[PDB]
Amino acid sequence: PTRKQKVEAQKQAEKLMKQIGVKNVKLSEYEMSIAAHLVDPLNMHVTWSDIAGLDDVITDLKDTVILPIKKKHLFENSRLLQPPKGVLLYGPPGCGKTLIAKATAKEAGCRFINLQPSTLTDKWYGESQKLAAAVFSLAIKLQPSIIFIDQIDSFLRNRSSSDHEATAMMKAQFMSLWDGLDTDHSCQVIVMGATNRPQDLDSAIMRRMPTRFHINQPALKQREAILKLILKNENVDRHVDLLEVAQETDGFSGSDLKEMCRDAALLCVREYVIRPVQQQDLHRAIEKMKKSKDAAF
Amino acid sequence: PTRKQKVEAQKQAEKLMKQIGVKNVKLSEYEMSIAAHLVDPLNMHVTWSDIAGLDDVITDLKDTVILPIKKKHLFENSRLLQPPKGVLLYGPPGCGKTLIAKATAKEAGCRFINLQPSTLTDKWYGESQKLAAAVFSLAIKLQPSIIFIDQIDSFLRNRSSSDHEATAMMKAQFMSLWDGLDTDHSCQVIVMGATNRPQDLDSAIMRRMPTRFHINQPALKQREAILKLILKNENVDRHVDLLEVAQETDGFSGSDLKEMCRDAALLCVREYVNSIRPVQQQDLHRAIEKMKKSKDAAF
Amino acid sequence: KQKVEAQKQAEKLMKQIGVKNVKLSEYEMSIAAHLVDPLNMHVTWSDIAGLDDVITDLKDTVILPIKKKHLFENSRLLQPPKGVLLYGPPGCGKTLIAKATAKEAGCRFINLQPSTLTDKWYGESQKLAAAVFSLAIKLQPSIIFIDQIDSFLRNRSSSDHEATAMMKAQFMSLWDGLDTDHSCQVIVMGATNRPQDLDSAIMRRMPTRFHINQPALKQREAILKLILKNENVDRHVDLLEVAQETDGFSGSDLKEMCRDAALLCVREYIRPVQQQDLHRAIEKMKKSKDAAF
Amino acid sequence: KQKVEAQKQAEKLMKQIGVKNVKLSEYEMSIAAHLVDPLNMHVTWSDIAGLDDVITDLKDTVILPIKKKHLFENSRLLQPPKGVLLYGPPGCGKTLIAKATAKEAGCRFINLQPSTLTDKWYGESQKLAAAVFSLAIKLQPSIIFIDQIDSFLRNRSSSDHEATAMMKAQFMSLWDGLDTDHSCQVIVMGATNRPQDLDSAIMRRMPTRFHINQPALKQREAILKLILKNENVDRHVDLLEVAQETDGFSGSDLKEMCRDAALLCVREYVIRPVQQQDLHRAIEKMKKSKDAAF
Amino acid sequence: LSEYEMSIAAHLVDPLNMHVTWSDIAGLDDVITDLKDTVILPIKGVLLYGPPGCGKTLIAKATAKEAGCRFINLQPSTLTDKWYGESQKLAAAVFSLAIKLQPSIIFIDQIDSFAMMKAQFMSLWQVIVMGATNRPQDLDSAIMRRMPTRFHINQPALKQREAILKLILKNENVDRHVDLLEVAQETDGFSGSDLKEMCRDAALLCVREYVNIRPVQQQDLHRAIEKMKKSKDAAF
Amino acid sequence: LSEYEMSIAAHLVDPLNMHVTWSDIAGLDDVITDLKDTVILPIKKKHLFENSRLLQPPKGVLLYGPPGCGKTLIAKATAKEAGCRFINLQPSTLTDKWYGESQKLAAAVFSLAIKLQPSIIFIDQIDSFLRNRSSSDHEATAMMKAQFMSLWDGLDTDHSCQVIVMGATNRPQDLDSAIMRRMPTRFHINQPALKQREAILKLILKNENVDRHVDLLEVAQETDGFSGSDLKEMCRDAALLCVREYVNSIRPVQQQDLHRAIEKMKKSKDAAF
Ligand SMILES: Nc1ncnc2c1ncn2[C@@H]1O[C@H](COP(=O)(O)OP(=O)(O)OP(=O)(O)O)[C@@H](O)[C@H]1O
Ligand SMILES: Nc1ncnc2c1ncn2[C@@H]1O[C@H](COP(=O)(O)OP(=O)(O)OP(=O)(O)O)[C@@H](O)[C@H]1O
Ligand SMILES: Nc1ncnc2c1ncn2[C@@H]1O[C@H](COP(=O)(O)OP(=O)(O)OP(=O)(O)O)[C@@H](O)[C@H]1O
Ligand SMILES: Nc1ncnc2c1ncn2[C@@H]1O[C@H](COP(=O)(O)OP(=O)(O)OP(=O)(O)O)[C@@H](O)[C@H]1O
Ligand SMILES: Nc1ncnc2c1ncn2[C@@H]1O[C@H](COP(=O)(O)OP(=O)(O)OP(=O)(O)O)[C@@H](O)[C@H]1O
Ligand SMILES: Nc1ncnc2c1ncn2[C@@H]1O[C@H](COP(=O)(O)OP(=O)(O)O)[C@@H](O)[C@H]1O
Ligand SMILES: [Mg+2]
Ligand SMILES: [Mg+2]
Ligand SMILES: [Mg+2]
Ligand SMILES: [Mg+2]
Ligand SMILES: [Mg+2]
């Protein structure tokens, strides 16, 4: 009688299941365990507005994912007006991919679940395959839901003969149960995949996500917008030309700008020990971050 | 008394096997555990008509692998004219591999069973080999049946030193029970599988499936045909130059063309949902550009 | 209950194979169920073609110690081997030879089916492994067969279950150790696709090794002529011609090629093969043989 | 399984560190064995010289949010920086700065010891790495120190063991993934000797970046002053004079040369201070030995 | 011997069953002549490692009963049972039996392969235990100590190969002037069990020839050499 | 010492099993003298220097130079005449296929280092074991190297455990950057010169018979670029002629066979060129 950590995690999984609010569906062992990673929508504090700079991609994702979910009774007659199985957001590191994912987990219904591949792989034999199958069994049992695989470039890597038989069979069972013999028809089971290097993801799984949204490094206008958002609620001195700094931070990403502004606010509060930012601390922060960014060279 | 979850699998498999329709065959513990995976033909909504673009392959599969199951009155005389003990489909990912088997499950009127390799593996000691045995036992028990294994290569990979003793033992038991000592009398049992990396399948299991079908990457004409297939029920209007749009999408596979058409239809319905309109080759040709930009991402 | 089915099956088969009543208490009885009936499988030496010298050598070296044993009783060294191994490329007669031997060799044949040896319960595996050799000498002469011996008896390593590694020493000690190899005539023959990782110890217990090469031109011609025997093949067909073009082809591959030709002929629904449908099939396989490449 | 003795050992350690009661199932317990008690450390801010701007910025950025936290709960933008790392040439302070932060910042600083994560059994390493963040948020405010993070989290390449890729991917995901990045206050810090091939995403994961450099002329005089405070240095020994001769040397090799020159006074006794001459001879010999390699 | 000591004595092989003697160990007489002064002399562990075959279990079978007093072989399978892990009891009862018949040598074939009962056996550890294994690589750390003497039964060399070969043809008819030294020179990597099969194939070459009663004129020896050479080249 | 510490202690060399002493170390006597004051002396008078903070023994000593000339010898000598139980690491006996093993085996080494103080460690062919850090290599190798470095510098200062790692390399040109820093007290055991030939022939000829009138300066002059091991290897060719002269029937070498040997070894030395 080994592998009895399922009851301890199962207590919390049932607690969270009751918290979210579901019908009397009863998971047995493995999907019951995977239910532990279910994320409550209220916990997420990020809405659609918090994602700034890029709105075309946001509108596309909305109209192509959430719209099929809502008023689904108007699209079943059409054979191919259902949400695609697999949406993957790609691009350079950062730039709000995980932010978009967190936003979707709240303002989309479609009870959200994070996979966290670590939980799948297990020590005992023939125990990780059970979890891999339970993932989709759950996705279709408490339907409708969305699955998230953070950093999907490593877990579902490009298949090779060198990988362990267990992990290879795991990523093959994923493919089989995704759109295989018995699932394709209609289950509104859509996986959402974050990726910083989509080239090494796969060739088959690359197609299993027909919808790929590019998340590029913020440009001039995008940078200005994302910085305007960050300083929306914070206090700054008057007549601060926000656009002017966009040129100074030519190649900065979203998080780089966030840190640039945060370090300036911290410099202000340190000078206190409650002072409006005079935009000179911002320039000093840009100059200081330019050196740290040029770490490799 | 451990591993008593066989009660739920027993109930499920018994109900499914009674639904599919069979005689009072006796299956006790493990054949029952595997019987839970039987796929009922009525559930499948795809047929030979839904599969298009490839006709020669479809005709060859309809004549060589299924007609022997139908024309049993003609092959009891000839020993060399029995059906092949295994046929596999290989090629690039997509374009009907997992769909041809879905159509077969319905059309061939067999006792199609989806193996789902995951069910074979078990944490307890020795259960994997016994389930591997029960698989073929049931197969011969309710012949004529077809066993399907999606991603055969990932499951039945090349034999190496770095594999668990149970997995290798079960993989060798498959080889021994499929065509080894006691088999191939008639048994009408054919094991087919689908894969996209056939080169790493095995040194000899490839021979265990002598007949193999290659699903070519969609070329121009079959691409146009499969696209016209999808564009028959929708509200697509006339004067759509199907040939040109099909020629534009060169490297596209079948699922990629399906996604392109779906995205074009959704773009078209955006206009209505904002406030029911034909796709007059413009939104289609423009969504082709979006799908092209989306494809050129691994570089 | 497992033991009830064991009772039925092993009592039916043991009595059907014509062995005088012996006491197979619990586990020897359980393994007796795997006994193969000499009548069921029907593959004679004539079915084996191409490799005539190898099959003759096997026939002699294995049967003559068993049959005509009276001539060999006075000798202490000329007795049936305590181990045989038939390796080589896949297919091409290995399990075919194994099947044929089980019929025209006497020496009641018992397949091992390694799967049955494993058991989740404690102690069942080792007890079954011992009961195998117990039964083998209980009803001698007997042949033991382990298909894909390389996988079952894989190279000993650290990454193996304690019971699967205990049965290794069990087998090794009971095969030719302290209480065997006197007057038992228990020959253990095995077949394997890959001889690389068989063993270092078990490899020694199977000294006699008959290697069945990939059928060459003449052996390919012979094996191909063999298959086209019952069906209505059209005369004037040059088997040597197709043999020339089937260089890389294997035995089972040629079997499937003939099957495809015959099924193509039947598609024209009662025609004899006139070497043109054979050409179609061989062209198809030459185009497709490089499935990996 | 060896986690029974590991739990027994980590018991005395965790409870010894003045903790709030928490239950650790199996893995967070295994990682708790790496806690470093503040009293065990014997390094403070005063033990560091030559770089006062860098350590002042370090405190201003990391300790100012931690300490006097009652002034930042009203603002969502002023939180401690996640992933503060200190790069630069080998030696000269990095690990010593980490120890100083560990001792003089409280917040139950913990070392990672990346070797403990690797395990032969399948699924062990991936599930163990999550226990790190689990314990960290369990007993926050905490610090996770990836010593020599250059090797642990390298630039992701196509060819790598299935274990390491999943390991670093789960690291990045648990860092700032779906359910994280709030007032938990967890702050990782790494001390790499080479920032060339650390990562592309992990680099962004670390916004704050400190530059520990080879001590300059003034910094070298400062560290030389600090070195011989406990020792009885001679009178009229110009530390600035020897700082010039020791141009390229870093801090550690300078401490070495100092110990070597000091041992000579003992050699002459086996007990007088160093009158600026033994220092010169020792630094000459050490320069020759350093340039002897090439 | 109430319950378990009887279960163990059930494996008590008899001296009359043994069929080996010192002459049967041909060529490897130096190791067994060094033995007596080492082991047989004290009475009137001991582990024998080496390559697969070539006298290990042969040397174990010889001196087992003809020398010593009523020794017993364990064959660890005897320990593991179906019920709730009673092995420990047996593991103890075994040594109990050992004190009954002072002395009785204990044999453990393939000791390398041979949970809690394992530690109990290690702990309980009069006679010197004899453990024969094909690989001393990873036998154990604690077990290796209890066995201080380790006789390396090496792969027979040229002279040793010829010595072991001449024994196989002692009571079997062969041709005169057969160069045993030459055939031994031919076989380089052969073991004793392999020379056995080679000479047996050579003799069968004559038996069959008669079947279709004759000495071996070294032609069948050469044929068996050429055949077993390819036979050995299986893994490679 | 549960599992790994025992695996490493299995390499513990016994002091009495080393037949080398300082009297058997010639040609460079300044090096062994510096060894006394820089390394042995801290270990000596330990009751004296506990008060001194920065005068404790060193951690990491490196002896580089072209092959031979005593790189290998002094090590065992340092273990014999100074106590301080010594262990050779056998760098090749570290790596294994099993995942996560090498890391634990290595950590066990530095554990053995401290729980058996005062313990020296010797890393032969450190270049081979700890080759220059490279961006492109087996992740396991770089991980092991970084773990070794961290545990070396990790929690050793202020502990006064007296662990003095020592590494020898034929070429220090591309050893490392940080690892080289880890071994500060580099000892330049260097190719000796004409003066050393006498020293090397002394220890070898003292036991056997060699007639007088054999000018040591002559054997030093006939060869100028020979190493420490090369001079011993050359004396072999000469001694063998004299030894053989009797077998074809116990004689001293009258400075002549040395000439033939030096000539033959000059010819052989001219092999690559
Ligand atoms: N458009 C935006 N508006 C506001 N903040 C942003 C935006 N884009 C990025 N950020 C900042 O970046 C951080 C999120 O980083 P992000 O989720 O993009 O990392 P990531 O690269 O997606 O992670 P991973 O590598 O695991 O995919 C947040 O703290 C947020 O403040
Ligand atoms: N000829 C076709 N007609 C209609 N749809 C098609 C065709 N070929 C592919 N598709 C589309 O592709 C999808 C099925 O993908 P497919 O079965 O080809 O993947 P696969 O490569 O078989 O997967 P696996 O790698 O598991 O074998 C379906 O949704 C279907 O709409
Ligand atoms: N010499 C032959 N004569 C007739 N048929 C042959 C011959 N060799 C192979 N075959 C064909 O090959 C099939 C048998 O394959 P075979 O028994 O050689 O597989 P195997 O390689 O022994 O199996 P495994 O790989 O498990 O050892 C039969 O259907 C038979 O028609
Ligand atoms: N500013 C300083 N003040 C006092 N000691 C110093 C200073 N800089 C360097 N040292 C000396 O250097 C040694 C510490 O080395 P350091 O921590 O710089 O190694 P490191 O190269 O940072 O390690 P890693 O390679 O893992 O980053 C101490 O013994 C200390 O005496
Ligand atoms: N010196 C010898 N004289 C005669 N026969 C020998 C000799 N050495 C080996 N043999 C032959 O080898 C066979 C015995 O093999 P052996 O007892 O060496 O196996 P083993 O290696 O002990 O088994 P395990 O590997 O299980 O320990 C006998 O049949 C015998 O004929
Ligand atoms: N400069 C020297 N330092 C130490 N030993 C020397 C020196 N010159 C000659 N020797 C003698 O040479 C012997 C060691 O030979 P060595 O040069 O180490 O050969 P190898 O390099 O092949 O090991 C020692 O016994 C030592 O007495
Ligand atoms: Mg992210
Ligand atoms: Mg598919
Ligand atoms: Mg076979
Ligand atoms: Mg440091
Ligand atoms: Mg033996």
Residue numbers in the entry:
A (entry chain B): 43 to 315, 328 to 351
B (entry chain C): 43 to 317, 328 to 351
C (entry chain E): 46 to 314, 328 to 351
D (entry chain D): 46 to 315, 328 to 351
E (entry chain F): 69 to 112, 128 to 197, 210 to 220, 230 to 316, 328 to 351
F (entry chain A): 69 to 317, 328 to 351
What does the original paper state about this entry?
The mitochondrial AAA (ATPase Associated with diverse cellular Activities) protein ATAD1 (in humans; Msp1 in yeast) removes mislocalized membrane proteins, as well as stuck import substrates from the mitochondrial outer membrane, facilitating their re-insertion into their cognate organelles and maintaining mitochondria’s protein import capacity. ATAD1 is a member of a large family of proteins called the AAA (ATPase Associated with diverse cellular Activities) proteins. Six ATAD1 subunits rotate and translocate progressively to form a hexameric spiral assembly. Each ATAD1 subunit consists of two subdomains, a large subdomain followed by a small subdomain, and the nucleotide is bound at the interface between the two.
To obtain a homogenous sample for structural analysis, we expressed human ATAD1 lacking the first 40 amino acids (consisting of the transmembrane helix) with an N-terminal His-tag and bearing a commonly used ‘Walker B’ mutation that inactivates ATP hydrolysis but retains ATP binding (Δ40-ATAD1E193Q). Δ40-ATAD1E193Q formed oligomers as assessed by size exclusion chromatography. We took the fraction corresponding to hexamers and incubated it with ATP before preparing samples for cryo-EM imaging. 3D classification of the particles resulted in two distinct hexameric structures. In the first structure, the six ATAD1 subunits (M1–M6) are arranged in a right-handed spiral with an open seam between the top and the bottom subunits (45, 003 particles analyzed), an arrangement resembling the ‘open state’ structure of Msp1, as well as other related AAA proteins. Refinement of this structure resulted in a map with an average resolution of 3.7 Å. In the ‘open state’, all six subunits adopt similar overall structures. In the next step of translocation, M6 continues to move upward, assuming the M1 position (top position) in the open spiral, detaching fully from M5, which now becomes the new M6, occupying the bottom position. Consequently, the angle between the two subdomains of M5 widens, and the subunit resumes its original conformation as it reaches the M6 position. Upon building all of ATAD1’s amino acids into the EM density, we observed a piece of density in the central pore that resembles a linear peptide in both the closed and the open state structures. The side chain density was clearly visible, and we modeled the peptide as a 10-mer polyalanine.
